[PDB]
Design a protein around this ligand. Structure first.
Ligand SMILES: CCCCCCCCOCCOCCOCCOCCO
Ligand SMILES: CCCCCCCCOCCOCCOCCOCCO
Ligand SMILES: CCCCCCCCOCCOCCOCCOCCO
Ligand SMILES: CCCCCCCCOCCOCCOCCOCCO
Ligand SMILES: CCCCCCCCOCCOCCOCCOCCO
Length: 364
């Protein structure tokens, strides 16, 4: 019986987040501070029997400040399954080259709309979405979209894309989408994974955007290259990014851009910006400290447009230090410290600390 299949096969978890966030400006008059507690209840039902299985997911968000992020929200999502392909309608949170929901604050950004994931066929995975609302990570209400830096107003985002495995090691991607009445963007990607005794990942990105509808003329191009070398417990990555045209890298305001040099604070997607990144990771497991992690990265950008000049420059340093409790009562309890420093000649200098204490508990 259907209703009961929904429950019998359902799963659920609760996540607790305690979150401290600090922004210190070099213009101290813009210094923000926040201490908050969040709760996230995730409910995923099973599917009703048949060719097309139906189900329902829910996500409950509660946040309050401790000193916006003072709210409660429940988002429903109807779903429909055939073979291994999935359609969702309602509240959405997913990642893709042209649109990615953010979850780096207390509570996640959500979109409203329809998302369709077609199961991998012959090495090919197709995805598509129609979105019509954005709910910023820090707020409870759904609003229409605008574009980062660029502005505009839009009540529809659409995209379709394919990810194709040319071989087991090489994946090619092509996504096309539109933020209605603001911009159109197309993305092509190539990713090579070399697994030896140790690994090298090569990630190439190219995206072009222009205006849509009656929006002011818009021209942007963004090329990215990221090479990530895994060497035992060590990892080093080098990234290169170049933004071109009259306009900066467009994306839905509030969301995450798919730029290889997008980091804790900056996207390095300013007009004409050229940037390079070095990144290091160490996993302390082999050493005997499973659960301890460290990450450090640096990005330097130049060629940024300042009026008719191109002498804008910036750099940002990030450091992540994190520990997950491995055993005992408090098992799965995780603490993470994210520290960022930014300096530029076209924006304000900033130091930022994020401290996140998180605990996840399976209900069933
Ligand atoms: C407050 C009542 C708790 C609800 C428990 C639901 C358990 C359903 O899963 C059964 C498997
Ligand atoms: C500056 C040249 C831009 C480099 C674009 C390479 C993108 C590779 O994707 C290929 C898609 O298949
Ligand atoms: C948490 C502090 C992060 C600072 C980064 C330190 C850089 C670590 O580089 C060490 C790499 O050294 C390679 C080891 O040299 C090979 C010889 O011995 C290897 C066999 O144990
Ligand atoms: C903000 C993270 C601070 C973690 C300090 C590093 C050492 C913690 O691991 C202790 C392992 O012993 C158990
Ligand atoms: C609508 C379901 C929300 C339930 C949230 C709290 C669940 C309480 O614990 C249930 C544990 O039993 C699992 C068997």
């Amino acid at each position: 019986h259907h209703h009961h299949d929904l429950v019998e096969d359902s799963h659920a978890s609760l996540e607790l987040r305690n979150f401290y966030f600090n922004r210190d400006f070099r213009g101290a008059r813009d210094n923000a501070d926040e201490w908050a507690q969040g709760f996230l209840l995730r409910l995923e039902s099973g599917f009703s029997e048949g060719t097309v299985g139906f189900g329902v997911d829910a996500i409950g968000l509660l946040g309050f400040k401790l000193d916006q992020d003072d709210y409660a929200k429940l988002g429903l999502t109807a779903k429909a399954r055939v073979s291994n392909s999935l359609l969702k309608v309602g509240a959405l949170h997913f990642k893709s080259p042209l649109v990615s929901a953010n979850d780096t604050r207390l509570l996640p950004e959500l979109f409203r709309g329809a998302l369709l994931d077609v199961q991998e066929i012959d090495g090919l995975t197709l995805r598509g979405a129609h979105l019509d609302r954005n709910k910023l990570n820090s707020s409870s209400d759904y609003q229409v979209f605008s574009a980062n830096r660029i502005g505009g107003r839009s009540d529809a985002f659409d995209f379709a894309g394919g990810d194709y495995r040319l071989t087991p090691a090489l994946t090619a991607s092509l996504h096309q989408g539109r933020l209605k009445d603001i911009y159109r963007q197309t993305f092509a990607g190539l990713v090579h994974t070399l697994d030896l005794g140790r690994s090298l990942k090569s990630d190439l990105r190219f995206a072009r955007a222009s205006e849509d509808g009656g929006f002011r003329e818009l021209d942007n191009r963004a090329f990215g290259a990221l090479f990530s070398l895994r060497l035992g417990a060590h990892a080093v990555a080098a990234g290169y990014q170049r933004i071109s045209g009259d306009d900066p890298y467009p994306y839905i305001a509030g969301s995450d851009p798919y730029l290889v040099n997008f980091i804790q604070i900056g996207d390095f997607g300013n007009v004409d910006e050229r940037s390079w990144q070095l990144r290091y990771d160490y996993d302390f497991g082999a050493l005997g400290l499973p659960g301890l992690s460290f990450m450090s990265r640096y990005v330097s950008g130049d060629n940024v447009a300042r009026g008719a000049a191109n002498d804008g420059k910036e750099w940002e340093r990030n450091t992540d230090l994190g520990y997950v409790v491995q055993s005992g009562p408090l098992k799965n309890l995780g603490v993470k410290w994210r520290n960022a420093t930014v300096r530029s000649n076209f924006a304000n200098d900033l130091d930022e600390n994020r401290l996140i204490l998180s605990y996840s508990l399976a209900l069933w």
